[PDB]
Ligand binder design. Structure first.
Ligand SMILES: [Mg+2]
Ligand SMILES: [Mg+2]
Length: 80
RNA sequence: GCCGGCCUCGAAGUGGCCGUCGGUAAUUCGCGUAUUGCAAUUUAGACACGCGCGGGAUCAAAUCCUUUGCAGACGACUUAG
């Protein structure tokens, strides 16, 4: 499917050069361990104390305050 | 906290004990919270002020004008109507 294009630009589009910015895993703080009780500083559940379950890829955390203990469900938050 | 008796509070009007009426985890629980989607002021208060509801209360003055001369450049002022 390397056919001729239906349209051609007025002048050749400049391509960007290679960036050399490899993606490397985020390293969470030593205090972010599973089961740690954390206070939510912002968002809908600001001021709520929830339980950390897992650390996600790019500074995101999976937490749940026990929904029957406080009305926080399973939720993603930001480690910051 | 809400309203009611009262009793005392004059440096620029204060607090109280006596009652009503409400709400109230000191302990332990049972249901609800989710979807504001990974943060985005937590629009939440008391000072007002201007209003409209629908009532109570109340039914006033001032100036011009004329007049006086204890006054006066004109205003103003002292009077009287
Ligand atoms: Mg009671
Ligand atoms: Mg004279």
């Amino acid at each position: 499917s390397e056919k001729a294009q239906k349209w051609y630009p007025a002048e050749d589009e400049a391509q960007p050069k290679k960036v050399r910015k490899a993606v490397r895993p985020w390293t969470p703080r030593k205090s972010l361990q599973p089961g740690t009780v954390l206070i939510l500083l912002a968002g809908r559940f600001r001021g709520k104390r929830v339980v950390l379950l897992k650390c996600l890829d790019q500074g995101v955390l999976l937490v749940t305050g026990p929904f029957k203990i406080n009305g926080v469900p399973l939720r993603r938050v930001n480690a910051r």
